[PDB]
Design a protein around this ligand. Structure first.
Ligand SMILES: *[C@@H]1O[C@H](CO)[C@@H](O[C@@H]2O[C@H](CO)[C@@H](O)[C@H](O)[C@H]2NC(C)=O)[C@H](O)[C@H]1NC(C)=O
Ligand SMILES: [Ca+2]
Ligand SMILES: [Ca+2]
Length: 274
């Protein structure tokens, strides 16, 4: 296991967003050309074991632990009826107090807020990626494709990410091998060597959220200078085309920085190797 390893993301210019938005309300459009300097991105979502090293070192108490609850999906026992605020749900107890991470050490850490993520990444000598860095990395060196690997969901009849199969929220068939999370090194890597950049856990980025973007060309953009919610990307094991088509690199959603949930984690980035 080298689950804190990073890969070099090459310098480049890419098209962020899309002129064929699938969820117009989320500000997927307009497409815009963005220049990104070379940097390093974690290959994997941060896992339970890796977060535990952080907590062992620092004693850090996550925001969910201090608040005393976090959001859990009903099917595995609010923004929607299937999200329940569960007392005692947190990163060590992902479905509530009588759940554990002991059997899933290599799964992504969950119930981590934006502040928790920044704390971890900074402890590790890293940072959160910007939304543009994240999306560039997700796209894996391909231009204007839906997914890290291309435009087909199951290329060559193979599952390439951990999302939902079946009728959401009543039945998850586990066709792709995982009803909940998968290990952080599951599924194929994209062209840059990243795993589970779409699906598995959602991923925090550093940007404040807006839906108003210019078509102007930009360099290492950081998002708007103010806001109330931070941007998350990539979708999760819960997503399905029928209700939340957000396992595309262009997709985007938001939460207040003190929010946490059972389908939301993160990975770090860095300008240089730590
Ligand atoms: C976090 O710290 C705990 C407590 O020290 C570690 O668990 C112990 O590890 C030692 C050394 O290998 C074992 O001898 C003990 O059996 C463990 N104790 C308990 C209470 O489980 C744990 O390994 C650390 N986590 C990480 C990811 O490094
Ligand atoms: Ca799945
Ligand atoms: Ca992910």
């Amino acid at each position: 296991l080298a689950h804190s390893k990073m890969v070099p993301i090459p310098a480049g210019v890419f098209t962020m967003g899309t002129d064929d938005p699938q969820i117009k309300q989320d500000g997927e459009a307009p497409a815009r050309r963005v220049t990104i300097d070379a940097f390093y991105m974690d290959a994997y979502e941060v896992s339970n074991t890796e977060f535990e090293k952080f907590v062992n070192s620092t004693g850090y108490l996550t925001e969910a632990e201090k608040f005393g609850d976090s959001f859990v999906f009903e099917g595995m026992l609010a923004a929607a009826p299937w999200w329940l605020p569960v007392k005692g749900a947190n990163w060590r107890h992902p479905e509530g107090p009588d759940s554990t991470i002991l059997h899933r050490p290599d799964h992504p850490v969950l119930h981590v807020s934006w502040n928790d993520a920044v704390a971890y990444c900074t402890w590790a000598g890293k940072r959160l990626p910007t939304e543009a860095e994240w999306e560039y990395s997700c796209r894996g060196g391909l231009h204007n494709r839906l997914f890290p690997w291309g435009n087909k969901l199951q290329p060559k009849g193979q599952h390439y990410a951990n999302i939902w199969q079946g009728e959401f929220p009543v039945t998850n068939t586990g066709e792709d091998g995982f009803q909940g999370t998968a290990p952080v090194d599951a599924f194929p890597p994209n062209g840059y060597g990243l795993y589970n950049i779409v699906g598995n856990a959602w991923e925090w980025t550093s940007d404040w959220w807006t839906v108003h973007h210019s078509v102007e060309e930009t360099l290492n953009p950081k998002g708007p200078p103010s806001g109330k919610d931070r941007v998350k990307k990539g979708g999760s094991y819960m997503c399905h085309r029928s209700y939340s088509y957000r396992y595309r690199c262009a997709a985007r959603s938001q939460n207040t920085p003190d929010s946490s949930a059972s389908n939301l984690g993160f990975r770090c980035a860095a300008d240089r190797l730590p």
